Structures are given as structure tokens and as C-alpha cells.
Swiss-Prot record, chain A:
Protein name: 15-cis-phytoene desaturase, chloroplastic/chromoplastic
Binding-site residues for FAD, renumbered to this chain: A21, E40, A41, K48, H65, I66, Y71, I248, D437, M447
Membrane topology field: Peripheral membrane protein
Molecular function GO terms recorded: FAD binding; phytoene dehydrogenase activity
Thermal properties: Optimum temperature is 37 degrees Celsius.
Activity regulation info: Inhibited by the herbicide norflurazon (NFZ).
Catalytic reaction(s) noted: 2 a plastoquinone + 15-cis-phytoene = 9,9',15-tri-cis-zeta-carotene + 2 a plastoquinol
One Gene Ontology biological process: carotenoid biosynthetic process
Gene Ontology cellular component annotations, sorted alphabetically: chloroplast; chloroplast thylakoid; chromoplast; plastid membrane
Assigned protein family: Belongs to the carotenoid/retinoid oxidoreductase family.
Top-rank EC class of the record's enzyme: oxidoreductase
pH influence on activity: Optimum pH is 6.0.
Residues engaged in binding substrate: R206, A445
Swiss-Prot record, chain B:
This enzyme's EC code(s): 1.3.5.5
Pathway entry: Carotenoid biosynthesis; lycopene biosynthesis
Regulation: Inhibited by the herbicide norflurazon (NFZ).
Temperature dependency: Optimum temperature is 37 degrees Celsius.
Subcellular location as annotated: Plastid, Chloroplast; Plastid, Chromoplast; Membrane
Residue window of the full protein shown: 101 to 567 of 578
Protein's recorded name: 15-cis-phytoene desaturase, chloroplastic/chromoplastic
């Protein structure tokens, strides 16, 4: 769609935040023939996908990011930039750890010959160590009405927690604790007793819609260089501007209530025909002008609050003999998903030294604790996953170095009844627009959600071209 | 053809005989040269002093052998195949003398007849084992050609573990099937081999149905092909071993030099010999071409075919093939019951496949017969004793083939050559060549049909090269 | 903007040249050779004893501008061993004796040629010289339109019409006809001889001859392959094209190889001999004028004989020799003329056996016997048919029953341009429309002309690539 029409006069759109939402807004506005001015607060691109190179030349990330087959807007973007080969697709499997049997792992293998949802049904049927046959029947009974259900049905489930809905549908409490604790922490870094059922249903839709919807991929290197730079190069080649260390301090308003300019941290005033806030909901809420604060659209945002998360990186002296070229569900009380980045990531490949990147969730009682306290808790959990290779007192494998990245306000906490509060990309303020994973879009608080919100934002701006050009 | 091609074929096995048959049908002149004084190759048989036949192997014809069915029909010898009951009879190693079977109902179509057979059988698989086995195999049977080719990287034992098929099922059922198809255990055999064999059970209704030839293969099967080739102007010559592939200065074939020095020439040349013999006869100037260099992976597997004539007629026998489920033996049959020409009402003869034979091809005939009698004492405990206390051996025949069919180990499929070689005028035939029906009689016949097809496709280029 | 992927069938001089100039233009050629040797009709093979034997005795001329350019571009000019500016002919009437046409290096063209004929007294009488000069003067003064008009006559026919004595046609032109197309003047087109005689009047050293310093696959074909590969091009041996698979509109879908492999590109080139192309032309193309005309162009039989003798011949030349034999054409002592084939105590004779129509079917021993009988006339005090004198250590007989197209009269309108009426399909080879005959120069020029036509159609070939992508 972002090819049609060539503007008489291109719009100058000021975008606050160069995360995937801001980068996507800038990409599709540039494709439409407009001039985006992307202003990033930090000295790094990507936001919640940002990474940094330390003194030894090793990268550490904000988080462990997994790309799914059921990410259509991400697939389109990678294809449009011709970087499809930068996604390292792994085996169609879901490998889970055994808390009862340390060092042992169980898995759900999706046959490449069976279509969706048969490959999924088969994976559950074939697995014998994570679910009993009666549990499998009760689980299938509980989920069948949900999978047959439409979009109206999944929206109606936003009033329940995962634990609440599973009990109502008769799904055994052991299934919710065995399988769904892992899935809840993976999607929103919180347990099923807090997470909205609508979140799990959009995730389970990956398993029944497309055949490879639930198939996983790792980026071949650090996201700022391998993903963010191709978008920046594309935006700049079409006349767009991308500026780092440009934090917006204030949204200055005209007497009628519309935006006058975006005042930067050094006082610099940036103007445009349209203004976009592609910042996280927490930062936007603090920067909303007093005169907007009582408008329903901005007042509803009080429900959407960032969830704490910690991303731990540990470089070991040895190469671990028992590892996978995949993502692993630790099924730990302290950890969520983890991966041996020296095996899964191309740019992070090392044949004699293995690095483990792990998501530490729930992180509410841990974001305040010291890095050594977090590493100790991680090593204690790793001694359960690698009992013959990793010991907490470094008796076996030894830590060369570590990197603990804390995000106390990451993605919005997808608790029940957040969906009516989620704003559309077009705001009731003429000339002001919103972008970000938290905005109204159907693919959760994810990389796909961020990119889609950007596409939806750019779409709303080009739709209002006539009104935005006359206002200039 | 304006002018018929003279095609020189080396080896009168089923591949060479098939190449000659279909080239003669196309109106060309095949010259089939056989090294030995017998036709058939790995299906060859010999008549001893007492007038009794002994074979290279126990051969079973399947319903899922379309090119074999076509050939028999074309020669009008369909009645020479003795189709047995649609059953799979297996011995019980734990219960000596006892047998279990998978009966395929003739009213149920494929794969329902198969599903029923497994469901009905209660002594070879437990109900949980049946479920895990069905789960493990269902994605595979639904899979296409690209899927089965992707399984060539795994052994049978490896793939069964991955798909969650119980280890007891792999040891109970698949040891028997692996030794039957390629004379090796599932820890060595490629999974692609088992998947092509299991496709017999789900494609056609009678695909897994078995048949015995009504007599010795040289007379009952090879002679009808020879008579057909000769009636259309083709030549079939025994005791004509090719000693050398003589080349022209450009690298193409000049002639085939025989053992007595005789030079045989043609417009096209075919090698329908086993891969082991071809590898030794490849000229030095061809040896580094990918097509011929890849052949190093394909090596013949040892096998032994034992024949034992007993003084009595065994009271407990079948008009069928039996899976011994032995560590030394593979499939066996009472040929005095199953084969028409070998029928004897007072004297029963047992033809048994001795596999794996790696540690046995070097051993003496008496050592092999002793091991066979010790295994027969487990299958017939009230009729056969190793010290000949019960039934007594009148005579025996031990036929050893130390390099039979290629050992279908994982990753052999990319090495398998097409019937058309990169050398202009030179072609290959044989069960080892690129064809979808394994190293079998069907594979041999299909490779022959595919070879003859490639020669007639290149008629224009082969006729111009002659002048 | 985006380099074209051009699939070329055949790594002869035409295919190698097409690949070389497409790589120079910044495109990606994929050169597929059917055999395990490069060069085609210039291919050679090393036997067990380490001695090379060739498809033919190849002579490079000064009047080969595209060959000179290629050698210069690859920096291998020193690989051509230029011989004396002479034309040495044998005397059939006087066995062992030789006559020659010496071209003075002080006289320019065609004066050096006129002088050579005037100075020679044993091959032409003074009246014969006058009648020959009279008969040829209108022809040498004539333009390109004139030489094309002579394609309707045989050499024997035109010589009789222009009043050139019948003895001149039999003495001088039998040798020249067999040298250029391995056929006698009663069959060869006069246009062929006129393009050859143009070597003698255009450039001073046009008629000067050179031998390659070694085997052509290593000394000439490898430098081209190394150059193509260094610029991103692909060269693959044992890749015979089995079928030209077509799209529903008639254009090429892919080239199907002998091992089943399907090779695709933005453009497709057939640098194969005309005989092989004619057999591979799809049925739907067979009635198009361009491909139907090719029925006239048929490969001519030729035999290249190599004989290694026990002794080094005392009476030999560091040159090419015209045997003026009824069975043989040109010959050379390769132990003298070729650098890599040099041997001081053992001499090797490489001889062209033409006309070969009645000989390609005969045995190697039958051919060697006929060659030894003819060599007993050229070396009567050194070689005897019953090996009484010099003895054969070994021999190599290379038969090409369909070599260069038989340049009989009226073949010129049938010769195709490098750009075919099929969009994306192109032709290369000595038989295609180019002015330097069925020669090494013709092959290289056709390659240059093919690569030129492909780069000229870059815009149309790049757009067609993306239209199919949709
Ligand atoms: C530990 C972790 C693991 C994750 N795993 C996955 C996964 O497996 N799969 C998946 O799909 N998603 C995953 N995500 C989520 C994903 O990272 C986010 O959904 C997405 O990147 C958010 O996009 P965004 O553009 O809306 O916000 P952000 O990426 O956070 O971008 C906002 C940007 O605005 C900038 N900014 C802030 N204030 C200002 C200001 N005043 N002026 C200017 N700029 C400003 C920020 O610096 C930032 O660059 C994970 C996230 C984390 C933290
Ligand atoms: C014990 C045993 C049991 C078997 N059971 C079965 C079964 O149940 N079902 C089934 O389908 N298949 C079975 N087979 C396999 C089957 O026999 C073969 O797949 C098939 O016969 C091989 O065909 P072929 O023509 O390619 O090779 P071959 O039959 O081996 O033919 C090659 C021929 O070339 C000849 N030759 C060799 N060297 C030269 C030379 N230099 N010059 C000229 N001729 C030469 C040989 O003498 C031989 O006749 C069995 C094989 C064995 C040994
Ligand atoms: C005896 C002899 C003497 C000669 N003397 C001279 C001389 O003195 N001077 C001179 O200038 N010229 C001479 N020539 C002629 C010269 O060799 C040719 O004119 C020239 O080499 C032909 O070039 P070409 O590339 O078009 O064809 P070729 O060199 O014949 O190349 C065609 C190539 O295509 C390959 N091919 C065929 N089919 C397929 C397929 N299906 N798929 C893929 N590849 C395929 C062939 O293997 C070959 O390599 C002589 C030739 C001979 C035989
Ligand atoms: C912060 N959002 C995230 C974070 N992780 N995953 C995720 C990663 C791996 C595995 C899974 C799961 F399979 F559980 F769905 C989800 C997401 O799908 C989303 Cl939407
Ligand atoms: C040497 N090849 C062989 C040898 N035997 N059988 C065979 C014979 C009897 C039973 C079975 C089985 F039922 F196991 F497939 C296979 C083959 O199907 C092939 Cl392909
Ligand atoms: C097959 N083509 C050939 C073959 N040989 N010569 C050739 C070689 C030596 C001498 C002469 C002659 F002097 F006669 F022209 C021609 C050619 O000029 C061409 Cl075009």
C-alpha cells in the first residue's frame, strides 16, 4: 500500500523513539514519499531490542528475542530490505526442561508432513513425559471451543487470567502449572495467575493458523547492526533523517491544544507537519501535556504499566557438551527462556567458549537487587539444568564474565481488561499520532506488534495527508 | 528406427535381461554378454547331480512390484507366480516352536488391512507399544517423496528413537524387516529403505502380498526373456566375461574386450554388472569423474543362502515365507510346500537366508550348517535337533555371495548413478542405479527399463555417431 | 545495476570467448562443458607415457585479429611460436624434394606475395603465372559484396571461369582447399578461398603462421578459464545439456543436464557445434527460418594422425608443410615446431588426414598404413612403410567425423546471427555469421559477437527476469 500516490509536497513527520515501532513508522512514511525525522534519546538503536559491544568486543542484549513464523509484518519488512537470510530458523520443536529430573529435557516435535493444527495435536500426543493421557483429554476438551472460536471470542476472554480460564474450561491444574507457567513467562514475563487469557489465545493461534506459525528463529547477530541499520539506511536513502542522542523533554503546545514543537533535552525545538510518539507507554504518560491528561484516550493509558524483566548473559571458560541449537524453557521459578548463543547465533559463534543468554522473570523482587545477587540465583538454577557441567561455587565450568541488563518497565503488563485502554495510532489531537507495541494491534506486546503499530501509524498519517498539508 | 542400434550389454542379470527386452521391443539389436554359464545373476540357480535345484537366494515377489508385474504380463507368464495368503508370519524367540502373524483382511483396503492386522495381533505388540508405533509412523506415511529422501541421513534405530517408536518394537519387528530387505541390522540400515518398504502396506491393497516363483529362476523367468530377445533379433551369449573397457583417444568406448581377447563393438554400451565389478573395470581416465568417483560409497553386502533336504516331511510347516527372528538367520521357507517345481510330498526342503553374513562368508559349509541346525532346533524343537536325533539331513547346498546388493547404509542415495552416464554412448543398469524400488528384483527390472529408455531417447545422437 | 546470469553450452573457443567477454562486461557466465576436457575441436589429451595428442593440427595466422587481441588481453602473446614467412610444399613428382614461397620481410603486402610467386620456378610456369594473375586481379580489387557473390561457385568452377589454368587449381589450390576445410576444390565454396587469399593482400604478416607452444587446454583454454573464474564466472566440466526445456510462450525455461540438474539464467547461449544444436532444437522452433536453414550446415569428417618415431629425422622443418598428397593435407614435426613437445632424439609427426569421408570408418592400423605409405614419398631415405628405416614407437589416431561445417557453395545465407529470434536465446560458434571462416578466429569472434549481443539486450533481459519473479 505504501507505494500508491506521490505527494505534491512531502510531509515532515517528527517521530520520538527509534525502537522497532519508530523505525517501522519512518520506513513506511519514507516509502509513501514523506520525510520522517526519527529522534532517538539514546546512543543506540532498537529500544527493547538494543545491544551493546563491551571492551572485549562481545555483545550483550536488552533481551533474548525470538522471531516466529506467525509474524507476517516482520517477514514483510525483512523481505522488503532483502535480509531474510539474517533469520536462523531452528527445528520445529519446543524443548522444555524437567524440574523433577535435573539435566533431563522433554520436547514437542511438530512433524513437517502434518499441517496445522495436526502437527501440534501430534506433538502433544507423541510426548509422554509432560502430560498423562487423562490430562491430554481434559486439555483437548478445554481448548477445542477456544480454537473453533473467532476474533469476538478471544476478545471476550480478556476479562480472565490464564489460571482462571484454565480452571473454568476444565484444563487440569497440573497442565496450567507444567505447560502454561512457561508460556506465560515467555510472552509477558509474568505467571498465569496474573496474565490475561487473550494473550495466551493469540499465542496459541500461531499453532493452528499457519503450518510454521509456531516455528522459531534467532537473528544472526546483534539487532542494532543486523536489523536496525538496514531500516536506517533505507530511511536515509529516501530522504529521511535518523538522529541519536535526541531525547524529547517536552511536548510544547499551540494555544488551541495542538503540538507547536517537540522540545529536546538541550532546548532545541523540532517542528513538523505531523508528530509521532513511538516511545514506551510509561515515558509517554509522563510527557502528556496537562491539557490532554483528562481526554479519555490519554486517561485510559493509566492501566498500561511496564513489567520488570532482567536479561542475564554468562560467558563460560568451556564449551558445554550438553546444549541445543534452540531456545529452551527452563521451567524454573526464577528463570524463563534461555539459549546457548555460541550455538544459536551466527555472529556470537565460539567453538571452545559457550555463552548462555537467559531471561530472568518474574523480576519484580529482583530489579532492585545487585548483579552478583542475580548471577548467584542464575548459577543456582543453572546447576539444576546442567548438573554435571555447571556448579554454583564454580567447581565445574567457570564464569569468564557476565552482563546483567535490567529493564524495570519493559512491555506493558498484559493483565486482564487492558484491551479497551490500548490506543489507536490516530490520536484525538490533530497532527499527533502514537506508535508502539502497546497501541491497538492484534499481535501482542512483541517485535511483530511494534512493527505492525509502525505500519498502522504511517498508514493513518498518509490517510490524513490532505488535512495535514492544508494545516501547514 | 531407420537403422537399429547395436547395444552391447555386460551382464545377464534381471537388469541386463530387462535392458535387452525393452531395447528389442523398441526395434534395436541388443547383444547381451553374460560372464557365467548361468542366467539371472543374483537370481541364478543350479541343478545338482540328483536333479535338485539350489538358488543364489530366497526371492519373494511383492504386489508393489509394478515393473515386474508388467514384464510377467508382457511375456504371458503371470501364472508362474504362486501368490500366498496376505499374512506376515513371525517366529517367537521366547516361545520355541510358536509363531505369531499379521493377517491382512481381503475386504479392507490399504492401509486399513494393515491397521487391522496390527490391532488384531496380540502377542507381538502391547497396546501402549501399538499407540507409540502408530504415532511415530503416521507423519512418515503421510509424507511425500522429498520427506523420504530426507530420512536417508538416519539409521533405522536412530529414526525410530527420534519418532518415539519403542526400542522393543525396533528390536522385535524392525530387526526382521531390516535383515529381510538388505541383510543388515536396523543400527546400520538407512531409514529410507524401511520407508519405501512400508509404502507397500499403504499404497496398493495387495502391495505387501507375497509370491514365490513356481520353479528355478533361470528356466522359469530368465529363459522367457532370452526367447523374447532372440525372437526379435537380439543376441544372448553365456561365458562372455568383459575383461576391459577399451577407450577411443577422446575418452568414449572403443570396444568391450572379452576374457579370450575378443573385441565386441556397438553404437551404445551398457554395464548391467554389480557396482563392485563395474568399480574395478572403470578406465583410469574416468575414475576422477564425480559420477564414477561417487560409486566408492556403494559396496556389496555379504549374504549366504542355505538349502537343507531332510529325510522326513515336516508336520509343522507353512505354504508361506517365515521371519525366523533369529540372530543368525533372516527369512526362510519350506520349498517342498511353497515352490511348485520343488514340490515333494515325503521329503521337505528348507531354503534359509543367513544374515548378517560378514563373520560367516569366510567360515566352512559344515560350520554354517551347524549354526543353521542350532537355529532350526529353536524353530522346530519337536522335529529338528542339531545332532540329527530327530529329522536327518540327506544333503545340503550353501551358496555364498560375499558382495551381493549394495549395503544400503545412510547417505548412499546421492552416490546412486542415473542410467545415462556423462560418457557419450556408455550407460548403466542394475538395482544399485538411481531408481525408487530399492536393491531388489523390481529395482533391477526398472533400472533396465530406464536404461533402454535413455538409449532410445538418444537414438538421433547415437545413430549420427556411428556414421 | 544487476549482473546477468548467462548459461553457455560448450567450452570450445566460442563458449570460452563468450564467457571471457561477458565477465569483462561485469556479468556472470555459467560455462557448461559436456566432456572432461576444454577446447572442443582444439582439445588435447595426455597419454600414459605423458605425451600429448590433439584433435587437430592448429595454425594461428597474423590475419587473426580477435585471437591476437585475446592473447594480448590474457598476456600470453609469447605462447605463439611464429615461424618464417614461407609456404613450404612437397614435390609429388620428385619424392623427398620441397618447393617454397618465400615472403620478403622488406616488401609490403601484396608485393611480398607477388614476389614469392615470381621467385618460385618449380611450382608454376611463366605463362601459368600470367593467367593466374589475370584470373585473380578482378577478385583482389573487388569489395565485400563481390566475395559474397562468389559463394555460388566451387573453387574448381570459378578458377575455370577466370581462366586460371587447371594445373594451378590442381597444384596450388588442392593443398589450400584441404588446409582450410578438409575437402577438395571441386566441392569447396570460392568465398572460402577468397577470405584466405585476403590474408596475403591486406596485412603484411597476415599469411604468417604460428604454432601454440604446448597443448591447447593448458596453454590457451586454462588462461581463459582462470580469467572468467577471477571475475565471478563459473566453468563446469562433465555438464552435457540433454534438453532445452521451454516455457509455454516458446522461450527457454532451463537447460536440463545429463544428470537431471536444471540450470537457469537470464540468458542462454549454445556454443556447441551446429550438428549437436540441430539435434537439440525443440520441436516448436524447428519450423522457424533461422533454425530450419541450419540443415545445409553439416560437419565434415577429418582425422588427425600422430606418429612417434625411434629416431630424430635429419630432413625436417621448423614449419608447417603441405604434403600435396591425395590422402594427407598439412603436417608438421611437433618435436621441432612445438616447445612443450620438443624432443632432440625422437621426432613426432602430427598429420591431417583429409578428405576423410572414406576413412573415418576404417581401422587405426588401416589409417597408419596409408599414412606410412604417404610418408615413404615425403621421407624416402628416412621412412619406409614396412618400418625398414625409421620405426614407430607409438601412434594416436583422433577421428572427428563431424568437425567444422562443410563449406560447400550457398551455405552463407544459412549461417545464423548470434542473436536468435527466440528472446533470451543466443548462438556462438565458428559456423555462426562472422567473416573469418570455420576457424579458431571465427570461433573467438563469434564469442565476442555473442557477448556483444547479450550486453546490447541488457535492459530487455533484466526486465524479463523480474517479470517472471512476479
Ligand atoms: C527481555 C526481553 C525479551 C523479549 N523477547 C521477545 C521475543 O522473544 N519476541 C518478541 O517478539 N518480542 C520480544 N520482546 C519484546 C520486544 O522487544 C518489544 O515488544 C519491542 O521491541 C518494543 O518496540 P517499541 O518500538 O514499541 O518500543 P521500544 O523498542 O522500547 O522503543 C522506544 C524507544 O523510544 C526511545 N525513547 C524513550 N524516551 C524517549 C524520549 N523522550 N525521546 C526520544 N526517544 C525516546 C527509547 O530509547 C527507545 O529506543 C522482548 C523484550 C525484552 C525486554
Ligand atoms: C540371498 C538373496 C536374497 C534376495 N531376496 C530377494 C527378495 O526376496 N526379493 C527381491 O526383490 N530381491 C531379492 N534379492 C535381490 C535380487 O536378487 C537383486 O536385487 C537383483 O537380482 C540384482 O539384479 P542385477 O541385474 O542388477 O544384478 P545381478 O543379478 O547380480 O546381475 C549382474 C550380472 O553380471 C554378470 N557379470 C559380472 N561381471 C561380468 C563381466 N565382467 N562381464 C559380463 N557379465 C558379468 C554376473 O555374472 C551377473 O549375471 C535377493 C538377493 C540375494 C542374493
Ligand atoms: C583437424 C583439425 C584441424 C584444424 N586446424 C585449424 C587451423 O590450422 N587453424 C584454425 O584456425 N582452425 C583450425 N581448426 C578448426 C578449429 O578447431 C575450430 O574452428 C574451432 O575450434 C571451433 O570452435 P567452436 O568453439 O565453435 O566449436 P568446438 O570447439 O567444437 O566447441 C563446442 C564444444 O561444445 C561441447 N558440447 C557438445 N555438445 C554439448 C552439450 N550437449 N552440452 C555441453 N557442451 C557440449 C563440445 O564438447 C565442445 O567442447 C581445425 C580443426 C580440426 C578438427
Ligand atoms: C515480550 N513478548 C514476547 C516474548 N517472548 N515471546 C516468546 C518467545 C519464545 C517462546 C514463546 C512461546 F512459545 F511461549 F510462545 C514466546 C513472545 O512471543 C512474545 Cl510476544
Ligand atoms: C535384497 N532385497 C530384498 C530382499 N528381500 N525382500 C523382502 C523379502 C521378504 C520380506 C520382506 C519384508 F516384508 F520384510 F519387507 C522383504 C525385499 O523386499 C528386498 Cl528389496
Ligand atoms: C578448419 N579451418 C582451418 C584449417 N586450417 N587452416 C590453414 C592452416 C594452414 C594453412 C592454411 C592455408 F595456408 F592454406 F591457408 C590454412 C585455416 O586457415 C583454417 Cl580456417
Amino acid at each position: 500500500f505504501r507505494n500508491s500516490e506521490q505527494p505534491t509536497k512531502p510531509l515532515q513527520v517528527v517521530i520520538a523513539g527509534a525502537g522497532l515501532a519508530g523505525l517501522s513508522t519512518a520506513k513506511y512514511l519514507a516509502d509513501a514519499g514523506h520525510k520522517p525525522i526519527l529522534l532517538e534519546a539514546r546512543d543506540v538503536l532498537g529500544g527493547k531490542i538494543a545491544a551493546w559491544k563491551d571492551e572485549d568486543g562481545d555483545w550483550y542484549e536488552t533481551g533474548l528475542h525470538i522471531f516466529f513464523g506467525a509474524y507476517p509484518n516482520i517477514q514483510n519488512l525483512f523481505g522488503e530490505l532483502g535480509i531474510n537470510d539474517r533469520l536462523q530458523w531452528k527445528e520445529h520443536s519446543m524443548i522444555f526442561a524437567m524440574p523433577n529430573k535435573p539435566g533431563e529435557f522433554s520436547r514437542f516435535d511438530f512433524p513437517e508432513t502434518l499441517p496445522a493444527p495436526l502437527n501440534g495435536i501430534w506433538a502433544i500426543l507423541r510426548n509422554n513425559e509432560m502430560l498423562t493421557w487423562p490430562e491430554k483429554v481434559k486439555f483437548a476438551l478445554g481448548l477445542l471451543p477456544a480454537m473453533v472460536g473467532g476474533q469476538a471470542y478471544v476478545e471476550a476472554q480478556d476479562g480472565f487470567t490464564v489460571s482462571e480460564w484454565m480452571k473454568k474450561q476444565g484444563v487440569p491444574d497440573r497442565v496450567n502449572d507444567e505447560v502454561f507457567i512457561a508460556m506465560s513467562k515467555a510472552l509477558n514475563f509474568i505467571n498465569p495467575d496474573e496474565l490475561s487469557m487473550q494473550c495466551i489465545l493469540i499465542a496459541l493461534n500461531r499453532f493452528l493458523q499457519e503450518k510454521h506459525g509456531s516455528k522459531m528463529a534467532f537473528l544472526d547477530g546483534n539487532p542494532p547492526e543486523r536489523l536496525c541499520m538496514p531500516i536506517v539506511d533505507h530511511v536515509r536513502s529516501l530522504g529521511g533523517e535518523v538522529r541519536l542522542n535526541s531525547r524529547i523533554q517536552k511536548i510544547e503546545l499551540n494555544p488551541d491544544g495542538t503540538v507547536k514543537h517537540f522540545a529536546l533535552t538541550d532546548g532545541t525545538q523540532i517542528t513538523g507537519d505531523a508528530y509521532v510518539f513511538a516511545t514506551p507507554v510509561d515515558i509517554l504518560k509522563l510527557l502528556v501535556p496537562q491539557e490532554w491528561k483528562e481526554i479519555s484516550y490519554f486517561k485510559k493509558l493509566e492501566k498500561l504499566v511496564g513489567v520488570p524483566v532482567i536479561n542475564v548473559h554468562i560467558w563460560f571458560d568451556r564449551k558445554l557438551k550438553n546444549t541445543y541449537d534452540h531456545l529452551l524453557f527452563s521451567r524454573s521459578s526464577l528463570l524463563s527462556v534461555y539459549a546457548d548463543m555460541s550455538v544459536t547465533c551466527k555472529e556470537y559463534y565460539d567453538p571452545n567458549r559457550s555463552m548462555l543468554e537467559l531471561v530472568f522473570a518474574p523480576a519484580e523482587e529482583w530489579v532492585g537487587r545487585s548483579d552478583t545477587e542475580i548471577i548467584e540465583a542464575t548459577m543456582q538454577e543453572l546447576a539444576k539444568l546442567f548438573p554435571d557441567e555447571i556448579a554454583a561455587d564454580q567447581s565445574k565450568a567457570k564464569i569468564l564474565k557476565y552482563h546483567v541488563v535490567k529493564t524495570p518497565r519493559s512491555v506493558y503488563k498484559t493483565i486482564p481488561d487492558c484491551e479497551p485502554c490500548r490506543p489507536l495510532q490516530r490520536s484525538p489531537i490533530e497532527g499527533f499520532y502514537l506508535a508502539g507495541d502497546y497501541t491497538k494491534q492484534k499481535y501482542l506486546a512483541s517485535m511483530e506488534g511494534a512493527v505492525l503499530s509502525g505500519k498502522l501509524c504511517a498508514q493513518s498519517v498518509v490517510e490524513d495527508y490532505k488535512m495535514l498539508s492544508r494545516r501547514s
